[PDB]
Amino acid sequence: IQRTPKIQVYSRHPAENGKSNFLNCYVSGFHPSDIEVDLLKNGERIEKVEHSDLSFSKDWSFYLLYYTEFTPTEKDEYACRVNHVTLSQPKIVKWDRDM
Template sequence: MLPPPPGNHSSASCYTGIPKVQVYSRHPAENGKPNFLNCYVSGFHPPEIEIDLLKNGEKMKVDRSDLSFSKDWSFYLLVHTDFTPNGVDEYSCRVQHSTLKEPLIVKWGKFSNSFLSC
């Protein structure tokens, strides 16, 4: 079992962290130019989480990093996929976690990458 996180917690299982979500492209987006779409989710606990990248509301095939944890025992994970922006399709990241009452959806914007902290 992991040692407890900092603070007055008797065990790591008592600690909860709400996910922070960042949706961004690897390179500046250009219509018709292949790129990579990333959804980086951090600061969450417990580690069970569901993260999906969506294209027009439909799940995309993704790759994901290994689940890792920070010094404060919160977890982080990167989900990513290749995509080609076209100015029409909408992309977003959907996160489902026990600390959220409903799924959190963060949209990606071509001219401003999306960062959301709860």
């Protein structure tokens, strides 16, 4: 069978406007391994996003971390857009500094 990815969007360090940080999107629990992940800023895709090396958990499901440096502000909105064979349409998860 196939397993849909779990998605978490968050920062490496506590969020503080004007302070450089790292924006993360962690996808896990999915199978097969092919997956498409974009980090968005005000709806537009951020270029040069990096990701970890493909690994998997004890239940064989895969997990990857996509990340990029960013300086959070009050106005700017960030999100993670994910597509996988199990999803009919890309799933967008907004960044909530309290999550």
